[PDB]
Amino acid sequence: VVTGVTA
Amino acid sequence: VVTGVTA
Amino acid sequence: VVTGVTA
Amino acid sequence: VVTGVTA
Amino acid sequence: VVTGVTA
Amino acid sequence: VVTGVTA
Amino acid sequence: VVTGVTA
Amino acid sequence: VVTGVTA
Amino acid sequence: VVTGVTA
Amino acid sequence: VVTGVTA
């Protein structure tokens, strides 16, 4: 599982 | 499991 | 498990 | 940038 | 930047 | 387990 | 920057 | 287990 | 910067 | 900077 949020 | 948040 | 937050 | 590899 | 490898 | 917060 | 390797 | 906070 | 290796 | 290796 990989979760990523970039902002 | 990898969780990442970059801002 | 890897958790990362960069700001 | 978030990079993740789970195995 | 977040880099993660889980095995 | 690795947890990291950089700011 | 957060780098993590768990095995 | 590695926990790190850098500010 | 946080670097972690757990094995 | 935090560096950690646990084995």
Secondary structure of J1-7 as H, E, C letters: CEEEEEC
- List CB contacts (< 8 A) between C4 and chain B: 3-6
What are the CA-CA distances from residue B3 to residues A5, C6, I6 (Å)?
Answer: 9, 11, 16
Resolution of the structure in the document, Å: 1.5
Nearest to J4 by CA among F3, D3, B7: F3
Q: What is the nearest CA distance from G5 to chain E, expressed in angstroms?
A: 5
Maximum pairwise Cα distance, chain C: 20
Q: Is the Cβ of D7 closer than 8 Å to some Cβ of chain B?
A: no
Q: Is the Cβ of B5 closer than 8 Å to some Cβ of chain E?
A: yes
What does the block give as tokens for C2?
Answer: 């890897």
Radius of gyration from C-alpha coordinates of chain F: 7
Nearest to F4 by CA among D1, H7, D7, C6: C6
Asked if G touches I (at least 3 Cβ pairs < 8 angstroms), the answer reads yes
What does the block give as tokens for I3?
Answer: 């670097």
- Which residues make Cβ contacts (< 8 Å) with residue F5, sequence separation at least 6? C4, C5, C6, G2, H4, H5, H6, I2
Residue E6: is it exposed, middle or buried by C-beta count within 10 angstroms (0-12/13-18/19+)? buried
Q: Quote the CA–CA distance of C3 and J1 in Å, as a whole number.
A: 16
